[PDB]
Write an enzyme that holds these catalytic residues in place. Structure first.
Site, mmCIF file in Angstrom:
data_model
loop_
_atom_site.group_PDB
_atom_site.id
_atom_site.type_symbol
_atom_site.label_atom_id
_atom_site.label_comp_id
_atom_site.label_asym_id
_atom_site.label_seq_id
_atom_site.Cartn_x
_atom_site.Cartn_y
_atom_site.Cartn_z
ATOM 1 N N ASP A 51 -5.769 -0.837 9.937
ATOM 2 C CA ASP A 51 -5.827 -1.692 10.666
ATOM 3 C C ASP A 51 -5.439 -2.535 11.863
ATOM 4 O O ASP A 51 -4.368 -2.306 12.195
ATOM 5 C CB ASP A 51 -7.267 -1.318 11.162
ATOM 6 C CG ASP A 51 -8.468 -0.682 10.753
ATOM 7 O OD1 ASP A 51 -8.000 0.996 11.415
ATOM 8 O OD2 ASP A 51 -9.778 -0.087 9.707
ATOM 9 N N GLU A 163 -15.486 1.313 13.140
ATOM 10 C CA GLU A 163 -16.250 0.601 12.865
ATOM 11 C C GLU A 163 -16.941 -0.267 14.094
ATOM 12 O O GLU A 163 -18.606 -0.794 13.181
ATOM 13 C CB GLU A 163 -15.231 -1.283 12.747
ATOM 14 C CG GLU A 163 -14.790 -1.009 10.980
ATOM 15 C CD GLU A 163 -12.810 -2.098 11.289
ATOM 16 O OE1 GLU A 163 -13.558 -2.959 11.822
ATOM 17 O OE2 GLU A 163 -12.258 -1.860 10.035
HETATM 18 N N1 LIG Z 1 -7.317 -10.083 2.792
HETATM 19 C C1 LIG Z 1 -6.728 -10.155 4.065
HETATM 20 N N2 LIG Z 1 -5.617 -10.989 4.436
HETATM 21 C C2 LIG Z 1 -5.712 -10.868 5.695
HETATM 22 N N3 LIG Z 1 -5.802 -10.601 6.411
HETATM 23 C C3 LIG Z 1 -6.808 -10.012 6.360
HETATM 24 C C4 LIG Z 1 -7.741 -9.343 5.033
HETATM 25 N N4 LIG Z 1 -9.258 -9.214 4.346
HETATM 26 C C5 LIG Z 1 -9.076 -9.456 5.726
HETATM 27 N N5 LIG Z 1 -8.461 -9.551 6.953
HETATM 28 C C6 LIG Z 1 -8.159 -9.100 8.491
HETATM 29 O O1 LIG Z 1 -9.716 -8.844 8.958
HETATM 30 C C7 LIG Z 1 -9.632 -7.959 9.684
HETATM 31 C C8 LIG Z 1 -10.981 -6.764 9.083
HETATM 32 O O2 LIG Z 1 -10.928 -5.868 7.705
HETATM 33 P P1 LIG Z 1 -11.493 -5.005 7.595
HETATM 34 O O3 LIG Z 1 -13.008 -5.629 7.231
HETATM 35 O O4 LIG Z 1 -10.851 -4.621 5.692
HETATM 36 O O5 LIG Z 1 -11.594 -3.809 8.484
HETATM 37 C C9 LIG Z 1 -8.155 -6.794 9.229
HETATM 38 O O6 LIG Z 1 -8.511 -5.859 10.163
HETATM 39 C C10 LIG Z 1 -7.163 -8.222 8.856
HETATM 40 O O7 LIG Z 1 -7.055 -8.725 10.060
HETATM 41 MG MG LIG Z 2 -10.412 -2.732 9.364
#
Ligand SMILES: Nc1ncnc2c1ncn2[C@@H]1O[C@H](COP(=O)(O)O)[C@@H](O)[C@H]1O
Ligand SMILES: [Mg+2]
Ligand SMILES: Nc1ncnc2c1ncn2[C@@H]1O[C@H](COP(=O)(O)O)[C@@H](O)[C@H]1O
Ligand SMILES: [Mg+2]
Ligand SMILES: [Mg+2]
Ligand SMILES: [Mg+2]
Lengths: 279, 279
Positions: A51, A163
């Site tokens: 994403d 999501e």
């Molecule tokens: N380790 C990370 N580094 C940078 N951005 C992150 C990270 N983890 C989450 N994000 C941000 O959070 C959003 C949602 O994460 P998620 O819960 O895996 O769907 C991502 O699409 C990023 O923009």
């Molecule tokens: Mg995501």
């Protein structure tokens, strides 16, 4: 208007898409909104996950186009790991695909740990792995808004249909943002935009994960959902799925309505009509 | 409609109110929502300021009532100062009026400073006083949501009409919360509810302030706004105001529309309708 159908409308799911055109409207959206706000560009955290990788590229396309149109814009991609990120390699690979105007790394550990050492101390209990994980998500939001506030940039959010339906994000964490370019896209559709944009297959075949837990790092979204993305996409796209599946997705959906609405006040109805709600 | 009539309707402002009844409806709203979410009560940050003082009392009244109805509930008042609060004494006075089941003090300095020192370090620049201030407001949200997640409590938000019409709050900071018991009340009216509850006059005669800046601590809202709450309340209650006043108030309203809506996506119309947004 079945519940599944009510969800498809509410989440703006298009059962069939032309990837090229979708990329067009989404890149067009970033431009039109940023133009209305007079912002200097965008800022987004790149996780190496599908994403952010996709939202990231759409952002770079937007600012380059804004520049060719005679404007002034910029995109800053920001790595936000907690200490050493398990899949740093993948994030770097996503960065290679994005080709952001600027990229920077901001380890959030000092901030997160400062808060949790303070909590345990003063509240005489330690944060569960889960709640601590939500702290990380929220601190990631604070970081993006800090950089955005200092450089005059809008915070891109990566929320999409896959999501949103299960409300799989942290309220005021990754869920908090200014602009949502992926709204309505199912997981497999998001992959179809990455293929159309020529992304390395490793970037869209990667296992979806929020990677927030200290004891189960890189945990598969599906492992927490109990629902695979094939199913979720199937459901969202209007296909039929096992009554077993539909019902679970539909309860996860209704109990998370509070996450898709601004704070509830006594004048709102969505929470009144609702059978229940879990926070 | 006149733009003014639109704001009044959109913000649910009632030109005339019965303080006694408003308290009953608002306490009833906390009970209904919480009862529908299975939450174990509420959690709110007490600043010593008028808003958190009122919302706080309404929360303690709600949990006592829930318990009296045979239920199970708890209200946690949380002091959230940055280092040492200039008006700590006023907060103590507010706490003595709230008489919350429990209360705790959580200094956000260590967490906030950990972030600032990290920012300056990695972005070879320093957070402005204004942006650092927003980090504090946002860390205050992190703390409430942490306590709420650990003890299963809902996060009360103190947003109201006088603060909403100007979008005078931090996005995802104090603006982030689950429940808004003061929605639609003007500043003027909020003081009436406090008087009806018999608050020490000093609790509602105090100078409104977000007290976020290091260089200008305890800064008066009015000084930052350029509009006295007396004027904002006249406008919101339907009374007349000098054109230049109504005009300044209506511009701040339209440009801050984004703070009163969920993240924007291409399917939303409010941003398309807007002449211009301002982050
Ligand atoms: N380790 C990370 N580094 C940078 N951005 C992150 C990270 N983890 C989450 N994000 C941000 O959070 C959003 C949602 O994460 P998620 O819960 O895996 O769907 C991502 O699409 C990023 O923009
Ligand atoms: Mg995501
Ligand atoms: N020093 C503080 N301690 C506790 N809660 C606070 C503090 N400052 C702000 N808050 C919370 O933030 C809300 C908004 O504050 P304000 O910007 O002054 O309207 C308050 O009503 C509190 O719930
Ligand atoms: Mg991820
Ligand atoms: Mg206030
Ligand atoms: Mg205040």
């Amino acid at each position: 208007m079945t519940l599944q159908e009510q969800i498809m409308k509410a989440l703006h799911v298009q059962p069939v898409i032309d990837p090229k055109a979708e990329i067009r409207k989404r890149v067009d959206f970033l431009k039109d909104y940023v133009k209305k706000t007079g912002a200097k560009g965008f800022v987004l955290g790149i996780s190496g996950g599908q994403d952010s990788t996709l939202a990231g590229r759409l952002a770079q396309l937007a600012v380059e186009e804004i520049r060719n149109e005679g404007g002034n814009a910029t995109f800053i991609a920001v790595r936000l790991p907690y200490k050493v990120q398990k899949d740093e390699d993948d994030a770097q690979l996503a960065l290679q695909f994005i080709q952001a105007d600027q990229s920077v790394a901001f380890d959030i550990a000092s901030t997160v740990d400062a808060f949790s050492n303070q909590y345990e101390n003063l509240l005489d209990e330690s944060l569960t792995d889960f709640n601590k994980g939500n702290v990380k998500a929220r601190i990631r939001m604070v970081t993006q808004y800090a950089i955005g506030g200092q450089k005059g940039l809008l915070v891109i959010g990566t929320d999409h249909a896959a999501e949103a339906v299960t409300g799989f994000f942290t309220k005021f964490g990754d869920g908090g943002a200014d602009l949502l370019p992926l709204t309505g896209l199912t997981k497999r559709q998001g992959r179809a935009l990455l293929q159309e944009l020529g992304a390395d297959e490793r970037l869209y075949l990667k296992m979806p994960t929020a990677d927030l837990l200290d004891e189960k790092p890189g945990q598969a979204d599906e492992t927490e959902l109990g629902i695979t993305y094939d199913q979720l996409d199937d459901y969202l796209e209007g296909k039929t799925v096992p009554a077993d599946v539909a019902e679970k997705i539909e309860k996860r959906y209704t109990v998370s309505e509070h996450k898709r609405q601004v704070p509830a006040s006594m004048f709102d109805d969505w929470w009144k009509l609702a059978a229940a709600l879990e926070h």
